Amino acid sequence: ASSTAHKQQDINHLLDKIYEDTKYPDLQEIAKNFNPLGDTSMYNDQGAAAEVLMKELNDHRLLEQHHWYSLFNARQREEALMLFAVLNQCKVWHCFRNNAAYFREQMNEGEFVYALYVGVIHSKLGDGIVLPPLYEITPHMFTNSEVIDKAYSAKMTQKAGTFNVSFTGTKKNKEQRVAYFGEDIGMNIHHVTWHMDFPFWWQDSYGNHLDRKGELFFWVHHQLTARFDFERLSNWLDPVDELHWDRIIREGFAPLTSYKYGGEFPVRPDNKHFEDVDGVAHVHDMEITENRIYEAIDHGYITATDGHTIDIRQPKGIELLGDIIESSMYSPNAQYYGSLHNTAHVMLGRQGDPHGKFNLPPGVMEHFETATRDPSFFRLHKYMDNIFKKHTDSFPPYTHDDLEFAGMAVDGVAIDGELITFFDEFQYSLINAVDSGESIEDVEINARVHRLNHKEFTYKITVSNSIGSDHLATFRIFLCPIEDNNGITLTLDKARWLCIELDKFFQKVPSGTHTIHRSSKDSSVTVPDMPSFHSLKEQADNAVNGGHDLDLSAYERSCGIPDRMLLPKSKPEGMEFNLFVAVTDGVKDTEGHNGDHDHGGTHAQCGVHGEAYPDNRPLGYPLERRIPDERVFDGVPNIKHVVVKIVHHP
Amino acid sequence: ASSTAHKQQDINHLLDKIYEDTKYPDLQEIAKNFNPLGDTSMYNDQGAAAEVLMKELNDHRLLEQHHWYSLFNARQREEALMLFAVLNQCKVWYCFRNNAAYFREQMNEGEFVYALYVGVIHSKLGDGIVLPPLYEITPHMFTNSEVIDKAYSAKMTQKAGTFNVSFTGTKKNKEQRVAYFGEDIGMNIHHVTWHMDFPFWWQDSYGNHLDRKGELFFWVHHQLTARFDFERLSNWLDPVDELHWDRIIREGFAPLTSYKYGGEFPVRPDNIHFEDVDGVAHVHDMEITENRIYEAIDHGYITATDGHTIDIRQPKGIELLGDIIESSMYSPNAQYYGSLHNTAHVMLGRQGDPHGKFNLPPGVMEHFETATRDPSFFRLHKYMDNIFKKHTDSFPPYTHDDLEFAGMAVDGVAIDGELITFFDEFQYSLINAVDSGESIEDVEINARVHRLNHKEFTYKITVSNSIGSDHLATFRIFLCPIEDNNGITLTLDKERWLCIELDKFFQKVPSGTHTIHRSSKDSSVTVPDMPSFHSLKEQADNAVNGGSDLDLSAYERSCGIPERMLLPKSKPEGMEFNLFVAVTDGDKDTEGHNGDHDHGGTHAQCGVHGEAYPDNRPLGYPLERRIPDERVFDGVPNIKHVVVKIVHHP
Ligand SMILES: *[C@@H]1O[C@H](CO)[C@@H](O)[C@H](O)[C@H]1NC(C)=O
Ligand SMILES: [Cl-]
Ligand SMILES: [Cu+2]
Ligand SMILES: [Cu+2]
Ligand SMILES: [Cu+2]
Ligand SMILES: [Cu+2]
Ligand SMILES: [Mg+2]
Ligand SMILES: [Mg+2]
Ligand SMILES: [Mg+2]
Ligand SMILES: [Mg+2]
Ligand SMILES: [O]
Ligand SMILES: [O]
Ligand SMILES: [O]
Ligand SMILES: [O]
């Protein structure tokens, strides 16, 4: 009943053809006859959350079905979180399943999908379930309008087909050169799943604390920004500028994408000034909020609601800044510091209709599914990144004694295999996006996208352990630019904030000289492509129908940079980069988190499900402080960088 | 085979399901086996137009099927006109039908529909045919995207339905108050049909001259502008401003409409400056063109290609100005005067993507089907109207002796019946917008729109004829504002350019005192709603089946203000207007024609099919010259105005 096979099948069924009433008789029967309030002993709160939601439902206060949904819309988010709160209180699976089935048929589908995903992720009852990829559950949020139109035509004509996705804009638009980054369906899943794992609305009263969430918020977005700039460099473009509230947003955007319900996503013209957005904020409010955050950074303390100071000149300072900048419910003082980043998403998202005169739906910036499609995403997030950077730059540069792992030398760094990127093809189903007739048969309708990929390779890191015993070590691997787009050689201080994280792992180094081997496929920064909805249905159905146990444990989380995007595209002619390796004291770094324990496949930016973050060092260590004197790093034996070449095969 | 029944049936079939290969086996056979080059005696040009078009087709130089079409696109227009030129040379119906069937399957559907319409209108072979309403042949061009999506959903689910249309924008957008004017499907048919009847590309080598076309171009757009402003006054709004190339376009527009192929129509933000449009014109080019036209007006002559003067200080001057402003192929000097109005349509239409960076399709301003949906249409056309007005204002005011119809006195003007407007509901089919499969039964899919309408009324004009014999008189009826939106009473000079034409008719006035009656239904300014495609199919099919002479001589042209929009909306509280009646010398006005003959039902602005324009007076007579001294008009017995009240019933 609560076996993995049945829970997976239940989730598959709940998410199937999400825009129509359920076609599964058992779910129909539950939605008709189950009473969320019939037996409140099924809830750890004795029904408090179910009472809240049922009262909103019965008073007709919930968003209707067949309507756009945005997580950044306060009331719509509150409604989705009402359902999450019910699911989160369920003691046993039948409560979770029955409430999901009941509210699927009552609530807006966007709210429902969101609540069910975060309910699965944050309830112990969801352990072992593999969530289908959102690009097959709500394909409109991941597929351009032209391809959706071809899917609608296939359905109108009752003919199967597979349709090729191209990028938006034209070759005249130089920004299209890097569309493969922000439009990649896996990169978008990475982004929404990170926020599902680490939601800004999280309150620890829901069950557990999300360790170092505010610092992970800084880090994951710093890495998105740095990775995008690496693609720009690969394509003869300059780095993104930062946004500013008093300066023009140079690069506009035409999504050429549509909601299933709500119309086409709005366009933003080139070279527009920010306008006040009715019901959201004035541009001036954003500037004041920014000023208040910088006041805290430059003071070295955050001001509490009663005026007392909260020291941020300590390792948790960056985390507390993440709390107040995002902002999350961990913010000590949202009345004063507001919500710079989340409000900025909405401010930018609404610039195509800032006063609501045109009845346009929210912009792509107002969904984590779609935000990175928009060039301005990266200008906004570089702007935010620079706020964090003023804090991280305020600390003293590391010294030799800070950085040295005594008796541990990196003798050599090499790669087995060529660093080669290419584009290949990937398919996903559009069936959930089309409308099914009563008693007419489905037909297969697929999208085919070109996605970046790379060949497998292996790091060979030769280390000498001259301590009298084997020692746990953390291997930290970054890719750093050597020259900018003007051919100017970068100093280490000018490169460090541009480096992208490639790996982090903990491994015992035996005494003597040994070469550590690490496969690119095992990176703690990346996760594989998601299994298809069809595959999850097939596996769950086969297990349930045969009475077999379903073991999906080999599947990884959906949070993490796609494996295929580990490396920047680079150029056909080749580009050289610095491969930076820091080997640090693993006993110190993992103290309290065990260096033998399993930390999963995505701990670098996505942490460890249900556990504390396993690396005590500041995110970005040892590159997160100013390095004005390269001699300091060059004198540390446990740090080494080497030149590598990446070639794109067109 | 040349009977009206069969010709109508043939046209109905050619226009059915226009986005798909023809489903009529007889048209299929023609398209496969007919040779446009197979009998030059079919054509009045010995086959030349057919050779020209076949060479473009055989060289693969024609626009592909399933692609947007804009009449303002030079090459696409040239291709459509190549097919028009063939149809126009056919001597007999089978040539016309067979070429249309042949090229339907070879040419872009937008080009084909355009060419077939103008071919029917401008060939004697088209006499008696009633063209289906374009809003049922290409419903995307008349139906917002939300309703189209519901139609697509109805087809995907194989379920018939009727869906309600409910105007673009929000109530926060004051411009939405008057959306019922420019978005009315019949107003859009009026506009496209006027341009089909009087095309700017016309050359008299096609067979006949279009009498007074350049002046009718001024007048029909002056009346569109003046009618729109009457709706604004009815809705507590100020008049539209005029466009200026160096000033902001205040009112943006979100069409919320889509092409069948080509994507969503582009949005224009509020408060934008004009930008240069790559491949079209620089904004400065528009200013220079405007300056050159005003140079001609203020010189009193147009400058020919060799520099000699073309006098415009004469009644034809306004027509020659229309020729050079539109501009049409009647322009004596397009190298110098350019094409201000047509280029302006494209400049405005492309302001959502002026450099083509985002690959957006042409704007609503780039089709006569859609142009009036855009608020900026009326700002552009008031701007153009003011150019014409500098010319019309340059002439001396009329004198008593100019205006008096001696022995003819208007004793009284009254209306039988209250002047009442309201909104009612109107339905049209969306079937041609959806995709039909192979062997898939149609389901009925309709759109329902709310449209302005009014109650029937009758003019009672009491006239005393003391000439001594019966005399032909022209009755000219205008509706004029009494006060502006600020409650300021307008002088006659300030009213005259705001007056809207309600009627013009020729009638013998007997000796003595008599009351002329004229039904609102018989206005020469208006035409009824088009018969539906379904009704035309039924009537053609019923006539063909059973050997019954189809005669549709009961229907009118599609050029003309819709009868339902004869009156401005007005207010629920009522508004008072001046009803202005000028009775003028019908002998003088129709000299060189036939005054008491059938002029059709739409001669005021749409002329008479295949005949000279029946009224020799300047368009707008007697209101088209300055009236600085109202005493002149008050002293003329054959002019009278009276106050009438129009009430809106909500
Ligand atoms: C559409 O309009 C008709 C008549 O105005 C009405 O009866 C019907 O309920 C409307 N449908 C919707 C969905 O509003
Ligand atoms: Cl009488
Ligand atoms: Cu994010
Ligand atoms: Cu963000
Ligand atoms: Cu026009
Ligand atoms: Cu025009
Ligand atoms: Mg991994
Ligand atoms: Mg050193
Ligand atoms: Mg075809
Ligand atoms: Mg020009
Ligand atoms: O984000
Ligand atoms: O975010
Ligand atoms: O127009
Ligand atoms: O026009």
Side-chain angles (χ1 to χ4, degrees):
Chain A
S2 56
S3 83
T4 294
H6 279 104
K7 297 195 302 188
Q8 182 72 48
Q9 183 183 247
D10 288 342
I11 288 300
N12 293 347
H13 289 178
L14 288 160
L15 294 171
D16 199 24
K17 305 205 164 74
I18 194 59
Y19 302 110
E20 295 167 37
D21 305 333
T22 184
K23 301 177 187 296
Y24 294 95
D26 72 310
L27 292 187
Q28 296 165 356
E29 164 82 12
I30 292 170
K32 167 182 258 176
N33 293 130
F34 176 71
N35 180 359
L37 302 178
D39 172 17
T40 58
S41 71
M42 60 183 48
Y43 306 109
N44 280 313
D45 70 350
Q46 295 71 238
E51 297 273 6
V52 170
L53 179 49
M54 285 303 305
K55 197 198 167 190
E56 294 306 290
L57 178 57
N58 290 333
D59 288 352
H60 312 276
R61 302 195 102 229
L62 297 180
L63 182 66
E64 64 189 335
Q65 297 192 322
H66 290 188
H67 192 292
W68 62 255
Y69 162 71
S70 165
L71 184 58
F72 289 93
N73 183 280
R75 171 59 186 193
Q76 292 176 7
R77 174 175 71 254
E78 286 156 357
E79 297 182 1
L81 296 183
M82 284 175 195
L83 173 60
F84 162 77
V86 173
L87 299 175
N88 186 54
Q89 290 299 314
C90 283
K91 292 180 191 177
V92 305
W93 180 251
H94 94 261
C95 174
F96 192 109
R97 178 199 65 184
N98 290 359
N99 274 293
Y102 182 88
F103 287 109
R104 184 198 189 280
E105 306 305 87
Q106 305 283 348
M107 295 189 66
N108 173 267
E109 61 278 357
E111 293 178 354
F112 174 77
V113 170
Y114 183 80
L116 187 66
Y117 271 62
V118 294
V120 165
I121 286 165
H122 291 281
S123 172
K124 72 246 93 268
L125 301 178
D127 290 359
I129 298 173
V130 174
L131 281 158
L134 278 169
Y135 47 76
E136 292 182 318
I137 302 309
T138 60
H140 277 79
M141 303 300 276
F142 299 84
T143 312
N144 71 51
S145 290
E146 195 182 321
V147 174
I148 292 295
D149 281 1
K150 286 181 167 201
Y152 282 6
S153 172
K155 190 57 181 182
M156 287 190 274
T157 63
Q158 304 170 29
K159 169 48 185 286
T162 297
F163 305 112
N164 296 342
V165 181
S166 62
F167 292 134
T168 51
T170 178
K171 288 157 84 73
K172 194 178 202 319
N173 185 346
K174 288 182 167 66
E175 185 84 12
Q176 182 193 79
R177 294 170 184 191
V178 288
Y180 62 87
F181 184 85
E183 301 189 355
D184 183 87
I185 58 177
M187 183 65 62
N188 287 119
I189 294 296
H190 162 59
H191 194 204
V192 347
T193 309
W194 189 91
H195 283 285
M196 285 183 175
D197 284 335
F198 297 99
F200 58 85
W201 49 260
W202 189 257
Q203 298 187 57
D204 289 351
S205 52
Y206 289 136
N208 54 95
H209 181 78
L210 298 177
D211 190 42
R212 298 183 72 179
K213 181 158 64 63
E215 189 174 359
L216 290 172
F217 168 79
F218 145 67
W219 184 242
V220 71
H221 291 93
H222 171 70
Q223 285 302 309
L224 288 177
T225 304
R227 278 180 170 274
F228 184 61
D229 267 356
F230 251 115
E231 305 303 338
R232 297 186 69 81
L233 185 64
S234 297
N235 285 282
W236 299 274
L237 297 174
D238 285 332
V240 299
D241 200 355
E242 60 178 344
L243 285 194
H244 281 300
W245 298 111
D246 70 325
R247 300 199 64 197
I248 68 170
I249 318 149
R250 265 182 302 262
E251 198 61 28
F253 182 53
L256 307 182
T257 309
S258 58
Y259 291 85
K260 169 80 178 164
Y261 302 102
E264 259 237 326
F265 278 91
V267 312
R268 187 187 59 259
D270 286 336
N271 297 317
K272 80 164 330 288
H273 284 95
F274 279 104
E275 305 190 38
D276 299 341
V277 175
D278 307 8
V280 174
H282 294 29
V283 179
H284 181 258
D285 308 336
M286 308 302 298
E287 303 177 295
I288 295 296
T289 299
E290 174 194 316
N291 294 346
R292 290 180 180 172
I293 294 154
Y294 270 118
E295 289 271 326
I297 292 169
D298 292 342
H299 271 311
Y301 55 80
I302 290 171
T303 298
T305 60
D306 69 359
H308 84 260
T309 60
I310 304 160
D311 185 18
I312 61 172
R313 293 190 174 99
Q314 63 122 313
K316 291 176 186 177
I318 182 68
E319 175 182 341
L320 301 176
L321 285 172
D323 297 338
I324 69 171
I325 287 172
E326 179 173 18
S327 62
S328 76
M329 296 300 285
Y330 291 168
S331 170
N333 192 353
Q335 182 180 358
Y336 186 75
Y337 292 107
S339 185
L340 182 70
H341 158 269
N342 285 350
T343 305
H345 269 253
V346 176
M347 290 295 283
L348 188 50
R350 218 69 61 71
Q351 289 301 306
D353 189 21
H355 312 300
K357 290 211 343 194
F358 301 120
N359 204 37
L360 302 189
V364 299
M365 280 293 293
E366 301 180 63
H367 314 276
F368 294 127
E369 293 93 325
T370 52
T372 55
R373 293 185 161 256
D374 189 330
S376 68
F377 177 92
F378 298 96
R379 287 71 176 180
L380 170 64
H381 284 77
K382 179 169 284 180
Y383 154 82
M384 183 184 69
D385 204 34
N386 283 335
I387 303 174
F388 287 115
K389 193 177 187 280
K390 194 177 195 188
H391 175 73
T392 58
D393 285 356
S394 72
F395 293 95
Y398 286 128
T399 68
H400 176 91
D401 285 351
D402 289 336
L403 299 162
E404 177 163 42
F405 184 4
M408 185 72 70
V410 180
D411 303 322
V413 175
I415 293 207
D416 252 352
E418 291 164 299
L419 301 181
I420 299 167
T421 65
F422 56 95
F423 287 96
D424 61 8
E425 298 177 0
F426 186 94
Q427 292 185 26
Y428 62 99
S429 177
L430 303 175
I431 289 170
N432 257 38
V434 308
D435 297 348
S436 71
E438 313 77 3
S439 285
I440 200 191
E441 290 292 85
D442 271 358
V443 76
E444 170 176 33
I445 310 177
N446 300 314
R448 182 159 40 215
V449 295
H450 277 132
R451 308 176 68 184
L452 190 69
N453 209 342
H454 67 90
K455 298 236 193 294
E456 186 199 342
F457 63 91
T458 303
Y459 305 100
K460 294 182 304 186
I461 306 164
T462 305
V463 287
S464 286
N465 173 1
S466 57
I467 326 164
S469 56
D470 311 348
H471 262 257
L472 224 219
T474 311
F475 292 72
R476 308 168 182 274
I477 305 185
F478 292 82
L479 194 74
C480 301
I482 295 172
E483 308 174 347
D484 66 13
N485 189 43
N486 295 311
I488 295 166
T489 298
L490 302 174
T491 65
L492 182 55
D493 195 44
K494 283 146 45 216
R496 78 188 163 81
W497 202 254
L498 284 47
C499 301
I500 57 168
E501 194 179 26
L502 297 187
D503 207 354
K504 187 207 297 182
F505 60 97
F506 318 101
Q507 188 164 325
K508 292 171 203 64
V509 179
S511 286
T513 300
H514 312 262
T515 303
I516 303 300
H517 289 244
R518 174 79 160 178
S519 174
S520 55
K521 283 223 143 169
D522 294 326
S523 166
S524 62
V525 169
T526 64
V527 296
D529 295 340
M530 300 84 215
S532 70
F533 198 16
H534 173 87
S535 177
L536 291 171
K537 295 168 159 180
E538 208 184 320
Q539 299 185 58
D541 288 352
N542 286 344
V544 168
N545 293 345
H548 330 277
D549 293 336
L550 214 216
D551 188 7
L552 305 171
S553 60
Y555 286 122
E556 287 179 54
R557 293 169 54 189
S558 287
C559 188
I561 296 291
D563 189 357
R564 56 168 65 251
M565 291 178 77
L566 176 68
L567 303 178
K569 176 195 179 190
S570 195
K571 289 171 184 177
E573 66 202 62
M575 292 177 64
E576 296 191 323
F577 304 105
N578 284 329
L579 182 65
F580 181 93
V581 175
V583 179
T584 64
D585 189 332
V587 162
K588 301 184 176 185
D589 299 345
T590 65
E591 184 190 16
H593 315 293
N594 184 16
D596 313 320
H597 173 238
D598 172 31
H599 298 113
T602 191
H603 59 81
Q605 293 158 29
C606 295
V608 180
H609 192 257
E611 298 187 10
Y613 189 81
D615 175 13
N616 295 320
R617 285 294 181 174
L619 272 295
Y621 185 79
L623 296 172
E624 90 289 5
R625 295 200 189 180
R626 293 183 298 109
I627 312 170
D629 185 353
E630 203 160 326
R631 294 174 298 177
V632 177
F633 270 55
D634 291 334
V636 170
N638 47 290
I639 294 170
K640 185 175 224 264
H641 55 85
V642 300
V643 177
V644 299
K645 178 164 50 62
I646 308 180
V647 179
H648 182 66
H649 285 189
Chain B
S2 298
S3 55
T4 297
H6 287 76
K7 297 200 295 189
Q8 181 76 51
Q9 188 180 61
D10 289 342
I11 290 295
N12 294 344
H13 292 355
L14 287 158
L15 293 167
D16 194 38
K17 293 192 170 67
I18 195 60
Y19 303 109
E20 298 171 36
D21 301 339
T22 180
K23 302 187 185 294
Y24 294 92
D26 61 320
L27 296 182
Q28 289 168 12
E29 186 273 335
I30 295 170
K32 165 188 169 82
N33 295 317
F34 177 68
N35 180 4
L37 307 182
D39 178 9
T40 62
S41 77
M42 288 190 294
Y43 304 105
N44 282 314
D45 70 345
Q46 291 75 43
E51 290 277 11
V52 172
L53 178 50
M54 286 300 302
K55 184 185 173 44
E56 294 309 292
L57 174 60
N58 286 331
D59 287 358
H60 317 272
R61 301 192 98 236
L62 295 180
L63 180 66
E64 66 187 352
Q65 294 192 327
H66 291 188
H67 190 289
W68 61 257
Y69 165 71
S70 172
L71 181 61
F72 288 101
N73 183 283
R75 175 57 189 192
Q76 293 176 5
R77 175 175 68 254
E78 175 188 28
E79 294 178 5
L81 296 187
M82 282 184 296
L83 175 57
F84 163 73
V86 174
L87 300 174
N88 187 56
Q89 291 299 322
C90 285
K91 295 175 182 170
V92 181
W93 183 246
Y94 78 85
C95 172
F96 191 107
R97 176 199 72 207
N98 287 0
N99 274 294
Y102 183 86
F103 289 106
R104 184 195 188 283
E105 306 306 270
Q106 304 288 337
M107 293 186 70
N108 174 266
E109 60 277 355
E111 296 177 354
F112 173 78
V113 168
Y114 184 79
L116 188 63
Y117 272 62
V118 290
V120 165
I121 287 163
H122 290 282
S123 175
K124 295 190 188 222
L125 295 175
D127 292 356
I129 296 170
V130 175
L131 285 160
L134 279 168
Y135 48 77
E136 286 177 322
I137 299 309
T138 58
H140 276 77
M141 305 296 280
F142 300 81
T143 309
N144 69 57
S145 285
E146 175 186 10
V147 171
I148 289 295
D149 228 13
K150 294 181 173 292
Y152 283 4
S153 177
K155 190 59 177 181
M156 287 190 272
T157 62
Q158 304 91 26
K159 198 249 160 294
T162 296
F163 307 110
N164 293 342
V165 185
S166 63
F167 294 131
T168 63
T170 169
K171 278 195 203 169
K172 202 204 285 206
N173 186 343
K174 296 238 198 320
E175 188 82 13
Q176 186 197 64
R177 292 177 183 186
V178 290
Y180 62 86
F181 184 83
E183 300 184 4
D184 182 89
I185 56 175
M187 185 64 62
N188 281 294
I189 296 306
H190 162 55
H191 191 208
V192 51
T193 310
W194 190 90
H195 283 284
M196 285 181 171
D197 285 335
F198 297 96
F200 59 84
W201 50 260
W202 190 255
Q203 304 179 230
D204 291 348
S205 57
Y206 290 132
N208 57 94
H209 181 77
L210 295 182
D211 193 32
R212 296 186 65 188
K213 181 156 69 60
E215 187 173 3
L216 292 173
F217 170 79
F218 146 67
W219 184 242
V220 72
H221 291 93
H222 172 69
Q223 285 299 310
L224 285 178
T225 303
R227 279 179 168 274
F228 186 61
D229 271 353
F230 251 114
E231 304 307 337
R232 298 183 71 78
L233 183 67
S234 294
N235 284 282
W236 299 276
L237 298 175
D238 286 332
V240 302
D241 202 0
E242 66 177 340
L243 173 154
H244 315 266
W245 295 111
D246 63 337
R247 284 204 236 160
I248 50 162
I249 317 153
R250 292 193 186 84
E251 204 60 38
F253 182 53
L256 307 185
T257 58
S258 38
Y259 293 84
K260 172 74 173 169
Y261 303 105
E264 185 103 342
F265 277 94
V267 169
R268 191 188 52 262
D270 285 336
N271 291 320
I272 65 146
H273 288 93
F274 280 103
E275 305 182 53
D276 296 346
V277 177
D278 306 11
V280 174
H282 291 12
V283 179
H284 183 249
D285 306 338
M286 309 304 293
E287 298 179 296
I288 295 297
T289 298
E290 172 195 319
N291 293 346
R292 289 176 181 174
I293 291 153
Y294 272 118
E295 289 266 334
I297 292 169
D298 293 345
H299 270 311
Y301 54 81
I302 291 164
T303 297
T305 59
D306 68 5
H308 83 261
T309 61
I310 297 169
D311 181 20
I312 60 173
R313 294 195 172 95
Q314 45 115 350
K316 202 170 175 165
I318 182 72
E319 174 181 342
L320 300 181
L321 285 169
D323 300 336
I324 66 168
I325 286 169
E326 181 174 13
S327 61
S328 75
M329 294 299 280
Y330 290 170
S331 174
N333 192 352
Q335 178 176 2
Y336 185 72
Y337 295 102
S339 187
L340 180 73
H341 161 267
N342 286 352
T343 309
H345 270 255
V346 179
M347 292 291 291
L348 256 177
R350 218 66 64 78
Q351 288 301 305
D353 188 24
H355 310 298
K357 176 194 243 174
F358 303 101
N359 206 35
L360 304 184
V364 294
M365 279 293 287
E366 301 180 63
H367 315 274
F368 294 127
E369 289 94 326
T370 54
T372 56
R373 290 181 166 262
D374 191 328
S376 70
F377 177 94
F378 299 95
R379 285 72 176 179
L380 171 61
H381 283 79
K382 178 166 286 176
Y383 156 80
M384 182 182 72
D385 203 36
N386 285 335
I387 304 176
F388 288 114
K389 193 178 183 285
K390 188 157 194 199
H391 175 75
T392 59
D393 283 358
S394 73
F395 292 102
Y398 287 128
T399 64
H400 173 95
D401 282 358
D402 290 334
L403 299 162
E404 174 161 47
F405 185 4
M408 188 74 42
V410 179
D411 299 329
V413 177
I415 293 190
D416 193 344
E418 289 135 20
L419 302 180
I420 291 165
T421 68
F422 55 97
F423 287 92
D424 62 7
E425 298 173 0
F426 185 93
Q427 285 185 29
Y428 61 101
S429 176
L430 301 173
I431 285 172
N432 288 320
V434 311
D435 301 340
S436 74
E438 185 129 29
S439 322
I440 295 185
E441 288 297 313
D442 284 350
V443 294
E444 170 161 22
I445 305 173
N446 303 312
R448 177 187 297 115
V449 290
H450 278 117
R451 300 177 71 184
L452 190 69
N453 206 348
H454 67 89
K455 304 269 203 235
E456 183 200 301
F457 62 90
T458 307
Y459 305 102
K460 298 174 289 160
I461 301 165
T462 302
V463 165
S464 277
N465 170 3
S466 54
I467 303 173
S469 61
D470 305 358
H471 260 274
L472 188 68
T474 311
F475 291 77
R476 309 167 182 272
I477 306 182
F478 292 83
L479 192 70
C480 300
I482 293 170
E483 56 185 36
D484 64 18
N485 187 47
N486 290 320
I488 297 169
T489 301
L490 302 170
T491 62
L492 182 52
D493 198 44
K494 283 146 45 212
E495 286 178 49
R496 60 181 183 90
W497 201 256
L498 284 46
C499 301
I500 57 171
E501 191 178 28
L502 300 187
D503 208 351
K504 190 207 297 181
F505 60 98
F506 313 97
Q507 188 159 327
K508 292 288 184 184
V509 177
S511 282
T513 300
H514 304 272
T515 299
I516 301 305
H517 310 251
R518 174 74 160 187
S519 175
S520 59
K521 287 170 135 164
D522 292 327
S523 171
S524 64
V525 170
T526 63
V527 295
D529 294 337
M530 300 85 215
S532 68
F533 197 21
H534 180 267
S535 170
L536 292 170
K537 290 166 163 189
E538 168 169 359
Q539 296 183 65
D541 288 353
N542 286 347
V544 172
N545 300 330
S548 311
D549 191 59
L550 197 181
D551 166 275
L552 39 63
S553 47
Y555 290 119
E556 268 153 274
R557 305 181 30 201
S558 294
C559 189
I561 296 292
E563 203 277 311
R564 56 168 62 251
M565 293 179 78
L566 174 71
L567 300 176
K569 178 192 177 192
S570 195
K571 293 169 182 180
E573 70 199 61
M575 298 173 73
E576 290 182 334
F577 304 101
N578 283 334
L579 184 67
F580 178 96
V581 175
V583 180
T584 67
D585 188 334
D587 286 356
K588 289 182 179 177
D589 295 348
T590 66
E591 253 183 1
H593 320 289
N594 286 67
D596 249 343
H597 292 39
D598 181 25
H599 307 300
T602 191
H603 59 81
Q605 296 159 26
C606 295
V608 182
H609 183 255
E611 305 192 357
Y613 188 78
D615 177 11
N616 297 323
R617 290 290 181 177
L619 272 298
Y621 187 77
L623 298 168
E624 89 289 4
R625 294 195 185 186
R626 293 179 294 110
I627 310 170
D629 184 354
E630 212 165 315
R631 296 175 295 182
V632 175
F633 272 58
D634 289 338
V636 171
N638 48 291
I639 293 168
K640 185 174 188 78
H641 55 86
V642 303
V643 173
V644 300
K645 184 168 302 185
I646 305 179
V647 177
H648 181 64
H649 284 182

